[PDB]
Amino acid sequence: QDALVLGFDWGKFLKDHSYKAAPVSCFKHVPLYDQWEDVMKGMKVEVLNSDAVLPSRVYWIASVIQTAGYRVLLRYEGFENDASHDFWCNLGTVDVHPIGWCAINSKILVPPRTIHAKFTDWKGYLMKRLVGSRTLPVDFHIKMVESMKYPFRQGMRLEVVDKSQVSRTRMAVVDTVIGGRLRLLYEDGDSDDDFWCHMWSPLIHPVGWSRRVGHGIKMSCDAVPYLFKKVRAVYTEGGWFEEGMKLEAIDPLNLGNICVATVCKVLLDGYLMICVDDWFCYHASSHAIFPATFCQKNDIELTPPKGTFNWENYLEKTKSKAAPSRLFNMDCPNHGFKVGMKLEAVDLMEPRLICVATVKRVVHRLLSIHFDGWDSEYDQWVDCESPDIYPVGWCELTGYQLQPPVAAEP
Amino acid sequence: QDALVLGFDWGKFLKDHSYKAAPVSCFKHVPLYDQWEDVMKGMKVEVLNSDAVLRVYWIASVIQTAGYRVLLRYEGFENDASHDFWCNLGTVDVHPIGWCAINSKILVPPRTIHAKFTDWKGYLMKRLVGSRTLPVDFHIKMVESMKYPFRQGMRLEVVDKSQVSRTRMAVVDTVIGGRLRLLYEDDDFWCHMWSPLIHPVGWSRRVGHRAVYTEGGWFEEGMKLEAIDPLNLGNICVATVCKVLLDGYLMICVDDWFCYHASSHAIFPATFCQKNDIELTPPKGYEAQTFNWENYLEKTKSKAAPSRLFNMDCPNHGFKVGMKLEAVDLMEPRLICVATVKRVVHRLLSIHFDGWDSEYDQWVDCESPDIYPVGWCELTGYQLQPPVAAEP
Numbered sequence: 001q002d003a004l005v006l007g008f009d010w011g012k013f014l015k016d017h018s019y020k021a022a023p024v025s026c027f028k029h030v031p032l033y034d035q036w037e038d039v040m041k042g043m044k045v046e047v048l049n050s051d052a053v054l055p056s057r058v059y060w061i062a063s064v065i066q067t068a069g070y071r072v073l074l075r076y077e078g079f080e081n082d083a084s085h086d087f088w089c090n091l092g093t094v095d096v097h098p099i100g101w102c103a104i105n106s107k108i109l110v111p112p113r114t115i116h117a118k119f120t121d122w123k124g125y126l127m128k129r130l131v132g133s134r135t136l137p138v139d140f141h142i143k144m145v146e147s148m149k150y151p152f153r154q155g156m157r158l159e160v161v162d163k164s165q166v167s168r169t170r171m172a173v174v175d176t177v178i179g180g181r182l183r184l185l186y187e188d189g190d191s192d193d194d195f196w197c198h199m200w201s202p203l204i205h206p207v208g209w210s211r212r213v214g215h216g217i218k219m220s221c222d223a224v225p226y227l228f229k230k231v232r233a234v235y236t237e238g239g240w241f242e243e244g245m246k247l248e249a250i251d252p253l254n255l256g257n258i259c260v261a262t263v264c265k266v267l268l269d270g271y272l273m274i275c276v277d278d279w280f281c282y283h284a285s286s287h288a289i290f291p292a293t294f295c296q297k298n299d300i301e302l303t304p305p306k307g308t309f310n311w312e313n314y315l316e317k318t319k320s321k322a323a324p325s326r327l328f329n330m331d332c333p334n335h336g337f338k339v340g341m342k343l344e345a346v347d348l349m350e351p352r353l354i355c356v357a358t359v360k361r362v363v364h365r366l367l368s369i370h371f372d373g374w375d376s377e378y379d380q381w382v383d384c385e386s387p388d389i390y391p392v393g394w395c396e397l398t399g400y401q402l403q404p405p406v407a408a409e410p
Numbered sequence: 411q412d413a414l415v416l417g418f419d420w421g422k423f424l425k426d427h428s429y430k431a432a433p434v435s436c437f438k439h440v441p442l443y444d445q446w447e448d449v450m451k452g453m454k455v456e457v458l459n460s461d462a463v464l465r466v467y468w469i470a471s472v473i474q475t476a477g478y479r480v481l482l483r484y485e486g487f488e489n490d491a492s493h494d495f496w497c498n499l500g501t502v503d504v505h506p507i508g509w510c511a512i513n514s515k516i517l518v519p520p521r522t523i524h525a526k527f528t529d530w531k532g533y534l535m536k537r538l539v540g541s542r543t544l545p546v547d548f549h550i551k552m553v554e555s556m557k558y559p560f561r562q563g564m565r566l567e568v569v570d571k572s573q574v575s576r577t578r579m580a581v582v583d584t585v586i587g588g589r590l591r592l593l594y595e596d597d598d599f600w601c602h603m604w605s606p607l608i609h610p611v612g613w614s615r616r617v618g619h620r621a622v623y624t625e626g627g628w629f630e631e632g633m634k635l636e637a638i639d640p641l642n643l644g645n646i647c648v649a650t651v652c653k654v655l656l657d658g659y660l661m662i663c664v665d666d667w668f669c670y671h672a673s674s675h676a677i678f679p680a681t682f683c684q685k686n687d688i689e690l691t692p693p694k695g696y697e698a699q700t701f702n703w704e705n706y707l708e709k710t711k712s713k714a715a716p717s718r719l720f721n722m723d724c725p726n727h728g729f730k731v732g733m734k735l736e737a738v739d740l741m742e743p744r745l746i747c748v749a750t751v752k753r754v755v756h757r758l759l760s761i762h763f764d765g766w767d768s769e770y771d772q773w774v775d776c777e778s779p780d781i782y783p784v785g786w787c788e789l790t791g792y793q794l795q796p797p798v799a800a801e802p
Contacts, residue, residue, distance in 0.1 A: 225626065230625055230626045230627075230716075230718055231624075231625050231718065232718050233622060233623070233624040233672075233718060233719045233720075233721070234622070234623040234624070235620060235621070235622055235672070235673035235721045236620070236621050236622075236623070237620060240621065240623065269623065269624065269625040270623035270624070270625070284623060329723045331723045331724045331725065332724075332726070333724065333756075
């Protein structure tokens with residue numbers, strides 16, 4: 001009872017408290033993403049009968065009551081309105097199947113002991129309930145394992161942004177790969193000098209990239225450039241960004257702050273060095289940069305420089321121009337994030353941690369993420385397509401540890 | 411009074427059907443676009459007083475807007491809507507408050523309400539506190555704006571309408587609101603001066619028939635994608651890259667060759683249609699209903715152009731399903747017709763021609779220079795096609 005401390009349980013959390021989880025279809029980088037909301041209220045599955053007596057184990061049919069990311073709340077067939085034995089099932093587990101699997105696999109359907117005496121004719125009860133029903137896709141689990149083969153492997157070398165000096169890259173080696181997240185070890189430190197990120201992270205690049213584009217590098221098998229997420233083509237009418245133009249940018253050393261910034265250098269391939277006004281590289285397609293006045297116009301606190309800030313007044317004092325709004329991609333796809341929705345988020349200041357979190361703001365494309373239990377100084381601005389946010393059940397699906405929603409060490 | 415057949419009236423049509431017009435702010439290419447933030451409900455103008463005999467003026471306020479047309483109520487009618495009247499804002503006889511005084515004209519009350527008050531000036535001066543009017547130079551700025559840079563006798567290249575893999579020498583016959591009528595040198599052709607179908611002299615030879623910042627691979631021959639069929643704009647078809655020309659242009663065909671720039675809003679990645687619930691027209695043979703890109707790529711032993719190369723980014727462009735506008739019939743581009751926004755799919759609009767079958771519908775980009783606000787024809791002097799299956 002007390003002795004089995006397995007860590008944060010979303011089921012307990014979301015049973016006490018009526019929360020909505022952001023659905024799987026919100027997150028493009030994640031497994032099951034395409035095969036998704038094939039799942040929803042009322043779908044039937046064959047699942048382990050857990051109130052059985054005898055493994056060689058037995059199965060029973062259950063139906064989706066509610067969804068919470070990858071997790072579904074199931075009710076065994078025959079409980080009807082009795083919610084008292086509803087249980088969560090993560091859809092990436094091996095013991096959930098389509099209707100039909102037992103028969104193919106020479107297994108047996110046995111009612112739960114709880115309700116077994118409700119009917120004699122269980123088989124015809126089930127036939128009536130199953131008419132016109134839907135079930136899991138065939139190959140569901142197969143297709144999932146297949147999408148969870150990743151091209152980054154232990155021992156591939158690459159260039160990563162230097163966490164101690166964000167103006168240069170440094171050499172790092174892949175140590176661990178789990179669900180598309182990477183643990184990188186830095187070639188000139190270690191053993192506890194690492195860096196976690198997603199494999200689509202804007203912070204990593206194939207060896208030789210920094211040199212080709214003009215990014216500073218600490219020091220001069222190699223992950224092949226094909227392995228990396230390539231950036232959106234940017235089309236412009238008229239000129240491009242230029243050294244000196246002013247804008248607003250998420251501070252990469254404080255993701256809670258969007259700041260007054262400057263273009264410091266135009267690199268090749270649409271990459272820019274920007275500084276808060278220590279240089280940091282964003283691609284021009286980056287959702288972490290915005291034109292002057294974006295904060296004021298959207299009800300975000302703009303972090304001014306050292307030290308009442310007004311854009312026109314600033315541009316006059318500094319003898320400067322704002323980057324034209326035409327250069328930015330500000331759009332808003334109908335992403336489906338809503339204020340209040342729960343999810344699992346990387347703590348970007350300490351990215352080995354993935355934590356229970358909440359959407360606190362949706363500002364077109366930008367979410368403000370709050371880590372439940374923690375002060376607002378820990379909140380983070382991220383793009384709605386960030387590879388660093390995950391649905392409910394992702395940590396469970398990939399076997400990663402999820403931090404509970406309390407202010408303590410892990 | 412019934413001998414006076416002036417053709418299609420937007421006033422009666424919007425009123426009778428309770429229709430709404432897409433605002434001028436949806437259309438970047440049009441006169442008055444830059445000045446449009448100044449036009450809003452409650453704005454005050456000096457306009458001719460029509461309800462008078464012996465040319466005199468009166469103040470009116472904006473009750474409703476429809477593209478360039480405002481519905482006006484003469485000051486002093488108050489809640490009486492019986493004399494509201496439409497006014498196109500590109501016309502000469504609508505003015506900023508103070509125009510009369512400057513031009514030694516007189517403000518005279520409409521004879522319907524004239525006996526409401528003795529002190530009209532006191533009444534007006536009260537109504538006028540804290541109100542807005544037109545910009546001082548509103549018509550000057552427009553007339554300066556409609557002084558077009560392509561002029562008559564000017565020469566360039568157009569896509570061949572009977573044969574789209576080829577351009578064809580043409581000359582500027584007429585200029586009307588940015589639109590050019592061209593006559594081939596080598597039967598006419600209309601387009602906007604921002605047409606992607608027109609190029610400067612030499613351009614055909616410069617490419618082999620914007621800027622672009624990218625990393626890694628570009629578009630490659632044999633890559634598959636979806637594209638609006640130039641020969642049937644109501645269809646978006648399975649298409650193939652045929653040839654990569656220079657400065658970002660691409661020769662495509664339906665699974666003959668047609669040119670699109672890589673930034674074009676008329677090409678999309680494979681599966682765009684099914685993701686967005688648009689009916690994809692599949693290659694002659696397939697049906698869909700059932701067509702499957704997964705299986706088509708497998709079978710044709712082909713790759714899809716990657717998604718990151720397409721210029722897909724979508725503004726709050728402000729078009730909404732149901733909104734009325736004036737659309738060029740792009741299969742017969744001399745015709746500009748009453749039309750409706752029938753679909754908004756990110757950047758892409760399906761335009762429906764009121765009175766015609768769904769087969770005349772056309773897919774166009776939200777920033778297409780070939781769609782115009784209600785009242786644009788009236789403002790430019792062009793003829794509007796009415797909303798009826800009939801000919802001009």
